Amino acid sequence: SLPNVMESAYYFEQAGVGLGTDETYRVFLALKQLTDTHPIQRCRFWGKI
Amino acid sequence: SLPNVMESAYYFEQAGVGLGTDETYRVFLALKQLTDTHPIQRCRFWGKI
């Protein structure tokens, strides 16, 4: 139930923001673990504070 | 007239092939030079031999 975090990160790179491909894919896999763990309808990369 | 070279290059990166975002963006700009120079209906990055 994930979004395409890499497509978003690609547009983010077009705008000159994001965490880069490596760390963003790492966060994407972490969100995948979140979806595996919990019965959740959405898991959106809100941000990095 | 031009194609979306960067969306294609992003999918290329995902598949693994490509020149990196940097050289692909250069190729996109060079294709734009070709497109504004010449009266082209449709243009496509064929490849790098």
Add this chain to the structure above:
Amino acid sequence: MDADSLLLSLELASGSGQGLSPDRRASLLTSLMLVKRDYRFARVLFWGRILGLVADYYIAQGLSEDQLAPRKTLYSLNCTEWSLLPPATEEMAMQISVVSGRFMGDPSHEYEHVVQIKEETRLVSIIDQIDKAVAIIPRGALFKTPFGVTHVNRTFEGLPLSEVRKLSSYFHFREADFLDSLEYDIPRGSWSIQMERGNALVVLRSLLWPGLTFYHAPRTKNYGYIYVGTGEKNMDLPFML
């Protein structure tokens, strides 16, 4: 950030969180090395980017033969269109105290106190008051020869991991084994030291100027600093820490 190595030196992938798009980064690489051609700098370094409101200022530096004093600064609203800034001085540093807020996007823009403050003067001033007391030299990159500070350490091997957390293994770029460390009786805790990318990257953040990111790979001769932020001074730090 050294001009030849922005594609090597990704602040955006390093955890800065804001940085250069591939369009901008491409224009920066070719335009900075041509900046080295036109004005004969020994080295060109990308300084960072002040966000502003309407348009983004992209800022670069140019260094002569090795010294900390001759630090010419540039700006460009379309990356390639580089223009040499006037030198900074205490008069323009004093003059911009009567103006606050975000940068605009137009060097010809003028504020009102009625003292007139050109956006250009604000850019040059804010650039220098950023670089004093945030621009890191890691311990060992530079020393002082007896005949002058040139001595770019060609044998530099980075900082060992034990020295990294201490904050005493980082010197300023100011005109000071010879420079003032980041511990200089500044507000204590004004630097956030972060171990990033599997302990292969030390990310330092200036909390007096948010958006300033500095890093170096440990055990390696890669280092550089960059400002991707709003351009206003965070005086507000001691309320936080």
Add this chain to the structure above:
Amino acid sequence: MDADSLLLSLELASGSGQGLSPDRRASLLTSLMLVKRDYRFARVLFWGRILGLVADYYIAQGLSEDQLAPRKTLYSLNCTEWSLLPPATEEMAMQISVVSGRFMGDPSHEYEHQIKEETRLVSIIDQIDKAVAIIPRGALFKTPFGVTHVNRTFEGLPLSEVRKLSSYFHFREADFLDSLEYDIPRGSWSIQMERGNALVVLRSLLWPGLTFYHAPRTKNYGYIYVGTGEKNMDLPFML
């Protein structure tokens, strides 16, 4: 290539075209770090790919303190489980002479020309490294103790002998090691430059898929074989 360079994605900037995907890149960074953990290698370098028909082999070798020592080759099919191959031999080089064609991606596959696919993989990686594995002049200096260490002040190559094959040595036994210009057929190494003069790209023609890179005036170097995994015997027709 190095892990630091795997972060940079110079595999794709070199113009090889094949390179690697970012998912695989992140997985290699984690798993090669833990290969350096489980096997106490001085360095762990990503050698590239042998492109198969069902799956692609993902290869890395282990470098001891002596960099020219016989190095322990590993393979993976999913970037995470790294399997340690056996070392190569002359006898194992002789067996696969009857076998040709694309790799399969199934290490258990058998050829009736029996030959194991591990046999092919090990001996092909061996033959590539003996024939073609570049180092620049100045890097990998011989310590007086009879052991080779990375020259920590290699400081890159200047642009004068970047263009020359004489400034480029192999990763093997031969005090300087073995120049490329004693390597036939003449012109077997292509010489190319990246954007600017920031980096020179060397593409193997006897073994297509290999693309060694090097940044002048910088200690960043490396090579990967991402290719079919066979020797281009056809080369002197083409030159």
